Structures are given as structure tokens and as C-alpha cells.
């Protein structure tokens, strides 16, 4: 069993019990995750649908990793202009693990 689902501009393929990268969850680790945004499902034949999403289809997941990564520094300057610029960056991460695929 595998499925394909939507989140904004991006489309993701995932299999039963698998882990996958997601965009930052605002609720962190504090809640389970579910999607009805599923647009393809296969278990022995890989049939496509042109109609908008699987009717009554559900994907269920749990949050396995969430947070804000290591701090970094990058710098900018110009030849013989005697200044120095510095940017700090961290970025947020989120990974989720499948608990169900239902149709």
C-alpha cells in the first residue's frame, strides 16, 4: 500500500508505516496528524483519478521529529569598501510517520 497527497504548492508520495518530510507544524509534537488531501492510492494496480481527491479517503500520521536546527553565520563585503555584513540563520524542521492509510 502507498498513497500520494497535497500540501500547498507541493505533492508528496508516501508508503504504509513510512516517515516523510513536511512543512513546519504550528502545534509541534502536541497532536496527531491526519490528511483527506489524498489524490492517488495503490496496493496492486497504480490507477490514476482525474476527479478532485479520493472521496472519504484518509491518511493518519504521528510527529516523529520537530524543532529549530543549528544556528549558522554567513557574511557579505565588497572589494576596497571597508564594511562587513553578517546574517544569522536557523531554519525549522518537521518529519511525520504514517499510522494508517484508509479508503
Amino acid at each position: 500500500m502507498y498513497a500520494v497527497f497535497q500540501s500547498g504548492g507541493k505533492q508528496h508520495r508516501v508508503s504504509e508505516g513510512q516517515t516523510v518530510r513536511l512543512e513546519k507544524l504550528d502545534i509541534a509534537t502536541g497532536e496527531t496528524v491526519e490528511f483527506a488531501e489524498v489524490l492517488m492510492i495503490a496496493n496492486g494496480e497504480e490507477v490514476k483519478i482525474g476527479v478532485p481527491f479520493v472521496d472519504g479517503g484518509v491518511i493518519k500520521a504521528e510527529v516523529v521529529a520537530h524543532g529549530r536546527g543549528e544556528k549558522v553565520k554567513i557574511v557579505k563585503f565588497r572589494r576596497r569598501k571597508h564594511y562587513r555584513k553578517q546574517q544569522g540563520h536557523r531554519q525549522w524542521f518537521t518529519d511525520v510517520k504514517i499510522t494508517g492509510i484508509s479508503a
Partner: protein
Amino acid sequence: RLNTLSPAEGSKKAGKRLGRGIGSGLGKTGGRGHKGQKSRSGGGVRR
């Protein structure tokens, strides 16, 4: 002492301190431009 007193602000300029780099405004010529006595010792010109 001061300690328990509320301070006053906006009544001193903070101040005579000279620029240390152009990210803070002014750098290697301190607002006097390049060379001549006008950049080293007062206004650089007589009466």
C-alpha cells in the same frame, strides 16, 4: 547612587563619540573628508 530613581532621556545627544565604521555612519575620515589641514587641525584656514 541613583538606584531607585527614574532616569531622564532625550536631554543629552549621546554624543561627541566618533564613527568607527560606515555601517554606523562615517568611517576612516570621521566626517572631515580626505586630506589638507582642514582635515587635521581645526578649519585649516587663517583670518
